[PDB]
Design a protein around this nucleic acid. Sequence first.
RNA 1: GGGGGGAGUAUGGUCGCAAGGCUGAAACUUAAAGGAAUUGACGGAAGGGCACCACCAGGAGUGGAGCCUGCGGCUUAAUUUGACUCAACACGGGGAAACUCACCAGGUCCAGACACAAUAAGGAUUGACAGAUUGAGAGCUCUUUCUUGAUUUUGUGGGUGGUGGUGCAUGGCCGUUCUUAGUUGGUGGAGUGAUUUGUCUGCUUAAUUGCGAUAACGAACGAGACCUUAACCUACUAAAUAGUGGUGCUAGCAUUUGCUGGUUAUCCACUUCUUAGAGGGACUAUCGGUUUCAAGCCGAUGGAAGUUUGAGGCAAUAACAGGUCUGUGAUGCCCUUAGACGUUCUGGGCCGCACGCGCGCUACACUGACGGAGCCAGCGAGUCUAACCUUGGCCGAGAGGUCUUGGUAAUCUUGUGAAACUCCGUCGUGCUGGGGAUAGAGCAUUGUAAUUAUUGCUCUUCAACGAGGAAUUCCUAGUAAGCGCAAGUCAUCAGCUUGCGU
RNA 2: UUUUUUUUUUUUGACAAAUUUUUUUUUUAAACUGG
Lengths: 73, 111
Amino acid sequence: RKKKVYTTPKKIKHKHKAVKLAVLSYYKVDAEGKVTKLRRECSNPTCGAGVFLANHKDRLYCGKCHSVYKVNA
Amino acid sequence: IRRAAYGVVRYVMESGAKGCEVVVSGKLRAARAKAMKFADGFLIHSGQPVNDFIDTATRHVLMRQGVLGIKVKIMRDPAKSRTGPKALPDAVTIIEPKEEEPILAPSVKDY
RNA sequence: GGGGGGAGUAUGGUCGCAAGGCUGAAACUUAAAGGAAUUGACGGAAGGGCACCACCAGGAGUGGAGCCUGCGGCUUAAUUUGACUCAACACGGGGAAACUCACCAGGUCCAGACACAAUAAGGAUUGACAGAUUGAGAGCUCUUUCUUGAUUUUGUGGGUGGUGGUGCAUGGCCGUUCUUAGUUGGUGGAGUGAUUUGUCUGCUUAAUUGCGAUAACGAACGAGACCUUAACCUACUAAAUAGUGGUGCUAGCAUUUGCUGGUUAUCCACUUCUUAGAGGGACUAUCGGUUUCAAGCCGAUGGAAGUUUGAGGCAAUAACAGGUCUGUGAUGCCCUUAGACGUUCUGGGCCGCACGCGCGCUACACUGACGGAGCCAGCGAGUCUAACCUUGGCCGAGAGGUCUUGGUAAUCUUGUGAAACUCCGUCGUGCUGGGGAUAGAGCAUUGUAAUUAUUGCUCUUCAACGAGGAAUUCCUAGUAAGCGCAAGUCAUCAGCUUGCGU
RNA sequence: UUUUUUUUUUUUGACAAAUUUUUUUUUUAAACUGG
């Protein structure tokens, strides 16, 4: 062993850096002063109405779960 | 090295040991290792009496140059041994007889 | 004569048909050449002993054949690597399918502590469904948009790890010199000194073991002594976890009161056999013969035991550039440290074959092979929060399966009913019913996984080999050799080793 | 009666260069009243 060749394409590629978007916590705001749910809550008893279900394409996906909460709609 | 080791052998001799021996082995003051041994008294290392009267210890001392080895053998004398054998196996002691009177006065004493 | 060479050379003279004498430089070159003695080592030197890692007399072989197992070479993506006479080559406890693992093709992760500085509660950062992608149900990475919250991230220094290097930087351990008897102070004597004597002419011993001699005396380590183990004890201490006899109950046969048995404690008694504590026992005892008359040796008797009773364990001074950094959270220095030489995961390799070598296994048959029948050991190992050794019943040709049981063990496996061996029969001098390599098909077992056959079994296939050249190994009595068995390694694999008995 | 008394030898050439070096330490046990 003298050196390394790295015949694999030259990938020092790393993960997405927990992608830094702007401020995002927004239900919606009407005038004086009410707020209503968008990106609705989960059906989990252990998700006590505080989690947002992402809608990618015909999917509802929770992030409180490690992997999978699928209430599809 | 020669002062630290002669200060250990003379302390063990002061403690009533019959013989002890200290070996220092390693790169003492050069790049090529040597071994110095310091002894006083006598030690037996032949047989079963080794299991009786010899105490040994090996220590690794960590130095700037490397590692030196410390070996200490101590032969406690069998005279102060409390349990087990109290003498070397080939040590014989003759009880000194008491001289008697030649004529012994031929007679009878009665009760 | 004035360091060794150059060199008794050059030149001139002289002695002259000769060889050659006599006289006789220099240039240049060189750090020693040399003398006498000391301690080792060596000798195709001598004298005295000793060893089956020497021979003699022999035995069993190995070298020749097939295989399986290490090494070299070749090959390879890689065939990881150390060790090369004794003192490398069934060695690294190295019987590697993954793991081991160090090598090859690839994929993750940080297990980068702490300190400083920056980003950063308008979020430092972490994790992920589905799809792409991937060997892969690795959120690897990407598409998507949820979650997380101050531990992380980035940078600068470091930290840590490494079966990465150096065993020629070391420790420890081990092997070897070295199956032998050797080694060294103190005081005295000799010598200017290195050193020497002690530590020896002779005889003796396994022995620097002794008798003795003695410018030495008195000592120390090694040898011995010692410890373990194997042999003896009708002696002591007692044993339903070892036996024996009687006694009850009971089986068979004979019958006449006997013989062979069974009975988990029926009871009683005992310790010859077995066990294990304390001991006894051998001291070369008694006698005879030999030598300087000592140390000893030889023969016979007795004895369980007469080689140091057998076998080990232990084991000096000085050393080797012996092996090991791949046993170690032993270790210096060097290297590397995030796309890693760290670690982990899937695959593969270490096993790849024109060939040479070392240790072995099976054989070449009639002192044999096969089939029935007899039937005899010793050393040991074995499972609680884990599946170890397994009896017995049942199933199956077998391998094996299944239902139970005993055992944490002098209790059960297990009397380990081992194998050679023994008896009766079949074969009949034919590479044959010797030999079982190579190969085909099936059935099982261990394992996540058996292909490059793990291994076991069943049927078929039926190779060389007809006693092995030069060479060469081991061995002196319960030894060699034959024969199996237990343990280590182990989940599975023993053609290996460590022991044990026959 | 000085008396003792082992007769022997075929063949064995070679092994590149450099190297292994050891010094004597304690200056450290130095502290006391004059009332």
